[PDB]
């Protein structure tokens, strides 16, 4: 996260770290959506152009964390993966369209002060909140700058951007399964996700029921916190029918 701040304790209890077993390293962010299911970006698991294709046994998820590098004894919980599900129409060849994946845990994780699931949006909450100017929040342990790494989880609040502005910022083909967020050059404030934040959540707090909803997944960008560029996020509601189908079938 670039130009963010240290998270408060328990501020993002759905935040998950995807962790490589060997060598031990951060792979991506992710989010807890139930006691058995973790949501992330497909590109965190499958990206052939970079020779990336992880299987269940390559990975662990670490839940309840604050410190990036420490083993947070008595606080974090570490889970093995039972199965990975990648969206069947994930477009890794072109533009990361439908950049979404689910991971089912081998065993349910115990909820605590530091571990708790985020909500997925219904159509109405999505329609109400996914509007240009409305701010969401991105969290992660990724790089602090494009070209270093944080001691603890970082947080930044960023406004959703008008779709024509998103489109005009980039040569990459954008789709309805994406939205973009970030400040414009003239707005003064800044901030963005960066490498390592991939797969983590873009959340919004509904003013109707005071609950946090995950509207986006950190998906792609060009650099980090560049003027005139914006971060692009998987549109979680647009892909919720797939999420529901996987959970119903394999849950």
């Amino acid at each position: 996260i670039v130009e963010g701040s240290d998270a408060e304790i328990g501020m993002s209890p759905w935040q998950v770290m995807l962790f490589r077993k060997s060598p031990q390293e951060l792979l991506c962010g992710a989010s807890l959506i139930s006691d058995r299911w973790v949501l992330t970006a497909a590109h965190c698991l499958l990206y052939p152009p970079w020779d990336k294709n992880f299987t269940e046994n390559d990975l662990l998820v670490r839940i309840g964390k604050h410190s990036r590098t420490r083993y947070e004894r008595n606080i974090e919980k570490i889970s093995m993966l039972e199965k990975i599900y990648i969206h069947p129409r994930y477009n890794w060849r072109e533009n990361l369209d439908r950049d979404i994946a689910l991971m089912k845990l081998k065993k349910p994780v115990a909820f605590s002060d530091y571990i708790h699931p985020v909500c997925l949006p219904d159509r109405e909450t999505a329609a109400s909140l996914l509007q240009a100017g409305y701010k969401g929040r991105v969290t992660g342990w990724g790089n602090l700058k494009e070209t270093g790494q944080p001691s603890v989880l970082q947080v930044v609040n960023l406004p959703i951007v008008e779709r024509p502005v998103c489109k005009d910022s980039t040569r990459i083909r954008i789709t309805d399964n994406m939205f973009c967020a970030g400040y414009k050059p003239d707005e003064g404030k800044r901030g963005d996700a960066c490498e390592g934040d991939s797969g983590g959540p873009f959340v919004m707090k509904s003013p109707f029921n005071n609950r946090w909803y995950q509207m986006g997944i950190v998906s792609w960008g060009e650099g980090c916190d560049r003027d005139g560029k914006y971060g692009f996020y998987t549109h979680v509601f647009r892909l919720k029918k797939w999420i529901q189908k996987v959970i119903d079938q394999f849950g």
Binding site: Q24, Y71, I78
Partner: peptide, 11 residues
């Protein structure tokens, strides 16, 4: 870099 995690999780 990263503190070693308990061996049980790497089994």
């Amino acid at each position: 870099d990263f503190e070693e995690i308990p061996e049980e999780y790497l089994q």
